[PDB]
Design a protein around this ligand. Structure first.
Ligand code: B12
Ligand code: B12
Ligand code: SF4
Ligand code: SF4
Ligand SMILES: [Ca+2]
Ligand SMILES: [Ca+2]
Lengths: 323, 262, 441, 262, 441
């Protein structure tokens, strides 16, 4: 019979987070990027405003990364120079943000000094105009020193800094608050810890709209459904009026997808899996695509082609489906 | 749990004076105190003393929404004062109240759909307050049916089963609880429910203890809103905790504060 | 289990009291309490009895594609989010092939489609059907294609032709395997439905939008055929996602019977990579059957991996058997590893001793499908429990050595394990990925 | 509401120290302290530390009744410790606990009938704790059959619907409440119910607040007994108040004092 | 509805899944919830039909004595204590008449019985029936007695004779008045049940004790007559109270269908005063109909007062119509008294002022039927509501003077009364009993 469209109106929206700052705002970025503001389920235009599209940050490291050849090949000319690596991501591959991952700072790895890390950040800031995301190597002591120095040196740039965690958030939160940067809150696939962490961060006087949620996603075929459902719950909470779940969501898909055997294993060893190149591209792209359906706002990626097909997917999703 | 602040009521001393001499300060200060406590709606009752209910209700609505964007719960038996109040409401409002008398139904249900306002429905007619939960339930079916009839969204109907003081009407309390939990049979989505909470402890010893205990009990039976003392901290904590134990809000260690600052 | 309002808004509203109840409203509330039978009211339409019985029935109908061991269940769903409960029936995947193709190009593609099955992480993925599209000028070419297709594969079939006369001549020899008929249109539904009904075949219903879809369904259902799959006419991902959500929502939340049927989706992206992403969106947003055009192993594997993922029961973990698993070669000089039941853990430890060609044993303890940390915390991994396994497995017979490697995240347990058992307990790497390094060391 | 004192448990330091070195002093004062708080039953658990269960329980049963005539709730998974404890029980007794497994039903049910003790029945299988209420009900129905089978009076069977911590298992709390509600539709007279109340707040913020709030909610759904902190005065006030609001006890201004000194 | 246990033990023990449920114990759950119906299970006795009725039906049936305007409804109670809800159907009362009486004694006594109605404090009490008892030796005396009684009254009838043929004779002329037939016993039940069915009359069933009663009822209901009233054979007060309590409890608490009927009690005390006290015990303890032998106004009035009291709704106070009512033939110099509209309150002022033979007007201020001190402590008695009604009563036109007499417990509302009213308020006695002494002075 006659069809009446079922629209679920929302009580609240996910926060708007501003990335970067232009010259007149005290930064040197060419433009800012806004994410969030969703007043509906992912891409449900017919029942709420989706004002900002999800964006993609491409990964750049302060070292030649321990990645498969397939991942290195699109960058072979610039992969030893973070500045030129960043430029190629923006100018040729359509990166919205640069994700600067300072793995070189690893005390068991290259052990890049604090001065070397801030020089890398300065190098990338001078190379491109897009906003930056900066996170350390994963060593708690080393990252404290590095991210503190980075927050000081790049003050005015309105960076997104990570990662704050349940047992390790105070120092980074303070650096973000005093030197005016945004923070990534990373929780271990747990919505209760996610919620409380945002509160603990906020209680240090960092405003709610300067915080983004990293739920610790799992890669395709390796626990991705678990992070998918947590992200749907986070979005549901946001729409229902839960302030401490209204932070935009960031996802480390580049890292998680590419640690999968399926992403890079040769077809000569696994004939049934097909050619390795488009399989690996799709392995990262599918991870992003499914997570986009659960409400991802910022996707951290690596392969330029995975990036291109995801941007196209986003483009199609942003077409209004209002009735 | 929507806490609707009870304090701006003409039956109170400091409020009765303010309306007589148009003093905005007592009204506006209570509006702020109740919101700080955790209320997300304000009950506005003209009082028994005032004569021109219309001119009083309008003033109450006018001085309140100046200092507060909370939902205004317009509370008066004078229907003409109700619509006169809705005409001044910048923000969303609710009507308090209507009973199951057909005379009142067609006088307020369209008036609720008109301004786009929630409607509180008491489970009684002119006979009085029913005791048995089945009779309370019967009036609730009528309220529910009169919502679909006039086109009021089911989640805009707030069924009030009328709680009475625990001393002289102790046997009503479990009837109210039974009525709340059987309301799940009246419709899907089930309609919302509200109580005049403080009424349960009128003329009793340790009213705060009685109020909050009954709040938790009623919420376990599906209560959605409560006209109550939003400046009672122990009551607010109970509201917060019961939400958690019903899985209506994601748990966190700071669950109390998050309800307060919601 | 029926709303008093629902029961009421279906009654004559006479208040005659023939039902032994003063009014209908009081009798509807009485019915919700289960007092008197619905037969106690002599009046009310036959539609009242219909919608009341349907209200107690599942919101979305189960309809089978094909017949036999090959047959696959579609629809039969109850949720909008898998975390509320689960999703039950994995999306059916159909690869499309055109009748405009020459016979040799057709056979080469069908043979390729038949090779689209996969093995990974202890799981086996398959696709479900081949879709034959009529693009050729002469109708005989369709009969040629289906006969050629049916003779080369045992997959389920879906026949895509608008002309009912073209479809029937191609259907005859293949009707015994219940192919899906695509599709009933407002132009041919009378003829198509007769075809679907007389052959007991599932019928696809096409509407240009939700409104057209709902009306056509009602007519076909009125003609007596209820094995339907829905096509809202959506050919772009945004419109599709919205329309599929509405079909799913209205059936489940509003009991809209016109939409109480599974959904068929058609990918439209010309780029095969874009098509896969388009398909990923469709399996996520409630499609029951999706039709792809690409047939590459590279493309289907991630799509089928996601399908498997989304449809896993969030309630019960995927678990492997608690029995010593031999890796690689079996010298008997081999190092025996210990880890949990969880399949995700087990193939993370095995796929770490297989990718690095380390012939050894993998001792999979029974932790009820739980992970290392989840098993421990649940008192499911205790040294005494481990000791029983070290003997209950009976491995001691295989190895010329009694060393046991232990999860690095459970380092403390081993000393409590080493003694009680009588084996040498080494605490390996925190992550299993460090097994390639700890063996050579 | 019957408050079963939880304090005499071997998981506690001083009770572990007292059972180990056979000192009746800490066991006996806790028996007195809980009784003064409002407990009318005392839980006795030898603990995970002490190993001689059969002889440890007998000592707890003996030293306690030397200073208390309260119902002793024998808490152990070891039946030889339970049956040996019922031997030296001069007071009324309660068995904690049995489950829905036949190899447990066949042993613990007739043992309770023979000694005439009350029997706590956990609504779970060998597989573990059920996820929803429907599964909890199935086991609860099986526990009911065993009562009618082995000839145990229904008002001596305490169905336990298994409450879990609200932080890691938040979705269980409403399932338990639904289970409590629906238990009345298993038998007539309906079986009694009990909770290990403190479990609801394990590892949470403000444990007393969560505990007493859930007690009120559970009572509203038909809870009859609770193993809980009898020395938590705010928790006792809640139990007293909720009885009033359920009309189980006639109201008086000194309602709290009357429950406490009942 | 029903308890899940009692459908389980009624259910067989096959565990054969034919119902759609795995085991029988779970089909017990599904029934108590509303998942399936008992019609699904093939294996079940006639208890299936019993489960259909015993669950749905009210615990105590409603049976009617008589037809038309004089018809009285018996049974249909749900409570053991009036305070839990209320008692609904006032005890029907019958005065016994013997067929040994001469034709003149019979009509004199029926005349007396016809006068057994009373007016008191706004209420009107009546009895419900005459019971004709067959005491005479020859059976023709019963038909004659029943004929003469039926011609002299429109009250309901209960016919008491052990020989069914005796009842059959008398029934020929009064069957349309639907009398109660007393009674079916173990020695006549078949003939008696046939009589009741043929005439559509309620039937009393007698058993010597609860056990015989229950067995006989089951036989009669199996013969197809369910319009029954119960007599457990109790002829002593203590036994009667226990037996009536059991019948009331078993029906209400256990749904014991054999006792799901109203009760008839027969007084046995030889002293008319003792008989009255016995009767109040019986109306208190659940008797639906009691047969008395005494017919004096002095005896009936107290009994009928208690009945009215006991059966008063505890939630709704009886109210007097507000307005002012004239005591005697009140002139324009007679006093004016203020009170509430609580029927009890009002008439304690009416009955006192009348006893002193004081002509005066009384205005009742509606306080929702609340006592003077009850409404005044609720706010519905203020100086305002007394003032407003001061004009609304139209008493201004009745009296020359303008003085108002206010209850002594409300003396605090004097000063506020005078200013608004324009009247001269006066403080009367705090209790009406002293108005006589207050009027004089
Ligand atoms: C999914 C999940 C669950 C799921 C169950 C999944 C499962 N089937 O096990 C569910 C929700 C049911 C669950 C339950 C609980 N969970 Co849980 N859960 C998780 C989560 C998010 C992911 C676990 C997982 O799948 N990990 C991935 C696999 C691969 O991990 P893995 O087995 O450890 O194996 C790796 C390594 O140990 C190592 N390794 C493994 N075997 C071997 C062998 C050798 C020889 C070597 C060298 C190395 C090695 O290599 C592997 C790969 O890197 C984690 C942790 C997180 N965010 O990281 C929490 C986590 C494990 N859970 C936790 C807890 C406490 C619980 C509960 C006890 C909570 C409660 N209710 O009290 C319950 C369990 C009891 C119950 N069920 O009632 C804790 C445990 C740590 C702790 N005790 O503090 C964690 C870490 C969360 C936290 N507290 O931060 N959980
Ligand atoms: C039954 C009862 C109720 C019933 C209602 C009955 C009713 N329909 O009014 C219910 C339970 C609902 C009730 C409620 C309350 N009650 Co009350 N109630 C009583 C009780 C037990 C009996 C009242 C009664 O029926 N009296 C009999 C009639 C005949 O009394 P009466 O109207 O006064 O009239 C007599 C005299 O005043 C005089 N008289 C009357 N009219 C006139 C006129 C003239 C001209 C003259 C000369 C004399 C005269 O003659 C009459 C016969 O002797 C009484 C007191 C008791 N035990 O004595 C308490 C009592 C009246 N209640 C009381 C109270 C306070 C209340 C409440 C306010 C309590 C509360 N919940 O806060 C509530 C009312 C508000 C509410 N409903 O929420 C108090 C009032 C005194 C006081 N204020 O201290 C009493 C005395 C109890 C006590 N505190 O000891 N109550
Ligand atoms: S018999 Fe049918 S129409 Fe008549 S009152 Fe009952 S439900 Fe209404
Ligand atoms: S059909 Fe009847 S006998 Fe068979 S399992 Fe079901 S309830 Fe038991
Ligand atoms: Ca509700
Ligand atoms: Ca109970």
């Amino acid at each position: 019979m006659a069809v009446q469209i079922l629209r679920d109106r929302s009580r609240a929206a996910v926060q708007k987070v501003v990335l970067g700052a232009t010259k007149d705002q005290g930064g040197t970025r060419s433009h800012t990027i806004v994410v969030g503001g969703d007043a509906a389920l992912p891409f449900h235009h017919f029942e709420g405003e989706i004002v900002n599209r999800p964006v993609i940050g491409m990964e750049v490291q302060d070292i030649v990364p321990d990645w498969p050849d397939v991942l290195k090949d699109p960058f072979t000319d610039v992969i030893n120079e973070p500045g030129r690596w960043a430029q190629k991501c923006v100018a040729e591959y359509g990166a919205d943000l640069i994700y600067l991952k300072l793995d070189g700072a690893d005390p068991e790895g290259a052990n890049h000094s604090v001065d070397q890390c801030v020089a890398t950040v300065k190098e990338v800031l001078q190379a491109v105009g897009v906003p930056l995301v900066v996170v350390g190597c994963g060593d708690v002591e080393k990252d404290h020193e590095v991210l503190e120095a980075v927050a000081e040196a790049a003050a005015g740039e309105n960076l997104l800094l990570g990662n704050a965690e349940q047992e390790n958030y105070k120092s980074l939160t303070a650096a973000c608050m005093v030197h005016k940067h945004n923070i990534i809150a990373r929780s271990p696939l747990d919505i209760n810890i996610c919620k409380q962490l945002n509160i603990l961060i906020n209680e240090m006087n960092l405003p709610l709209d300067h915080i983004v949620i990293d739920p610790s996603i799992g890669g395709l075929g390796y626990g991705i459904e678990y992070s998918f459902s947590i992200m749907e719950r986070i979005r549901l909470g946001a729409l229902q009026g839960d302030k401490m779940l209204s932070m935009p969501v960031i996802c480390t898909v580049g890292y998680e997808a590419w640690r999968a055997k399926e992403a890079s294993a040769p077809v000569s060893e696994y004939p049934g899996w097909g050619k390795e190149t488009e399989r690996g591209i799709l392995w990262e792209a599918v991870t992003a695509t499914a997570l986009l359906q659960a409400g991802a706002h910022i996707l951290l990626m690596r392969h330029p082609e995975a990036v291109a097909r995801v941007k196209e997917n986003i483009d199609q999703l942003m077409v209004s489906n209002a009735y | 749990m929507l806490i609707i602040g009870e304090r701006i009521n003409g039956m109170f001393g400091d409020i009765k004076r303010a309306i007589q001499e148009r003093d905005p300060a007592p009204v506006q200060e209570w509006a702020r105190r109740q919101e700080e406590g955790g209320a997300r709606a304000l009950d506005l009752n003209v009082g028994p003393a005032v004569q021109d209910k219309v001119s009083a209700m309008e003033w109450l609505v006018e001085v309140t929404q100046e200092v507060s964007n909370l939902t205004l719960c317009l509370d008066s038996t004078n229907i003409k004062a109700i619509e006169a109040g809705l005409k001044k409401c910048k923000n969303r409002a609710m009507i308090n109240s209507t009973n199951a008398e057909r005379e009142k139904v067609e006088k307020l249900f369209p008036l609720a759909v008109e301004h786009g306002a929630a409607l509180i429905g008491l489970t009684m007619n002119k006979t009085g307050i029913p005791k048995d939960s089945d009779t309370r339930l019967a009036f609730a079916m009528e309220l529910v049916a009169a919502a679909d009839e006039f086109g009021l969204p089911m989640e805009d109907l707030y069924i009030d089963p009328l709680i009475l003081p625990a001393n002289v009407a102790q046997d009503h309390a479990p009837e109210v609880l039974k009525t709340l939990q059987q309301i799940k049979m009246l419709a899907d989505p089930a309609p919302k429910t509200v109580l005049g909470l403080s009424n349960v402890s009128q003329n009793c010893q340790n009213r705060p203890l009685i109020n909050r205990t009954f709040l938790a009990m009623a919420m376990a039976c599906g209560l959605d809103a409560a006209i109550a003392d939003a400046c009672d901290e122990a009551l607010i904590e109970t509201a917060a905790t019961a939400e958690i134990l019903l899985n209506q809000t994601v748990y966190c260690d700071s669950f109390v504060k998050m309800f307060k600052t919601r | 289990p029926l709303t008093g309002l629902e029961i009421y808004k279906q009654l004559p509203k006479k208040n005659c009291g023939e039902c032994g109840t003063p009014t209908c409203l009081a009798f509807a509330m009485n019915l919700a309490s289960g007092k008197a039978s619905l037969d106690s009211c002599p009046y009310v339409s036959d539609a009242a009895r219909e919608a009341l019985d349907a209200a107690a029935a599942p919101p979305i109908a189960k309809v089978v594609l094909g017949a036999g061991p090959t047959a696959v269940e579609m629809g039969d769903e109850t949720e909008l989010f898998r975390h509320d409960k689960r999703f039950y029936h994995e999306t059916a995947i159909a690869i499309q092939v055109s009748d405009n193709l020459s016979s040799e190009e057709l056979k080469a593609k069908v043979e390729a489609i038949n090779g689209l099955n996969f093995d990974r992480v202890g799981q086996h993925y398959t696709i479900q059907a081949i879709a034959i599209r009529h693009d050729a000028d002469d109708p005989a070419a369709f009969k040629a294609a289906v006969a050629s297709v049916a003779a080369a594969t045992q997959l389920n079939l879906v026949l895509m032709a608008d002309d009912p006369d073209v479809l029937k001549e191609a259907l005859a020899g293949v009707a015994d395997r219940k192919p899906l008929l695509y599709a009933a249109t407002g132009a041919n539904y009378e003829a198509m439905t007769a075809l679907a009904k007389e052959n007991n075949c599932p019928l696809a219903v096409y509407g240009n939008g939700l409104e057209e879809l709902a009306e056509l369904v009602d007519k076909i259902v009125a003609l007596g055929h209820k094995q339907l799959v829905l096509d809202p006419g959506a050919r772009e991902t945004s419109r599709a996602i919205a329309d599929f959500t509405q079909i799913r929502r209205l059936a489940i939340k509003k009991r809209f019977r016109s939409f109480g049927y599974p959904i068929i989706a058609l990918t439209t992206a010309a780029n095969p990579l874009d098509e896969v992403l388009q398909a990923v969106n469709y399996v996520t947003k409630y499609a029951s059957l999706v039709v792809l055009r690409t047939d590459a192993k590279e493309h289907l594997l991630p799509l089928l991996s996601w399908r498997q993922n989304l449809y896993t029961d969030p309630q019960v973990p995927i678990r492997v058997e608690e029995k010593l698993n031999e890796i690689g070669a079996v010298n008997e000089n081999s190092p025996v590893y210990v880890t949990t039941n969880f399949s995700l853990t087990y193939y993370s430890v095995e796929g770490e001793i297989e990718s690095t060609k380390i012939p050894s044993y993998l001792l999979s303890v029974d932790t009820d499908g739980l992970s290392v940390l989840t098993a421990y915390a649940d008192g499911k991994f205790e040294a005494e429990k481990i000791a029983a396994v070290m003997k209950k497995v009976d491995l001691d017979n295989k190895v010329k050595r009694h060393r046991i490697i232990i999860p690095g995240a459970v380092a403390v347990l081993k000393g409590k394990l080493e003694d009680l058992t009588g084996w040498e307990v080494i605490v390996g790497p925190r992550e299993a990925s460090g097994i390639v390094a700890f063996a050579r060391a």
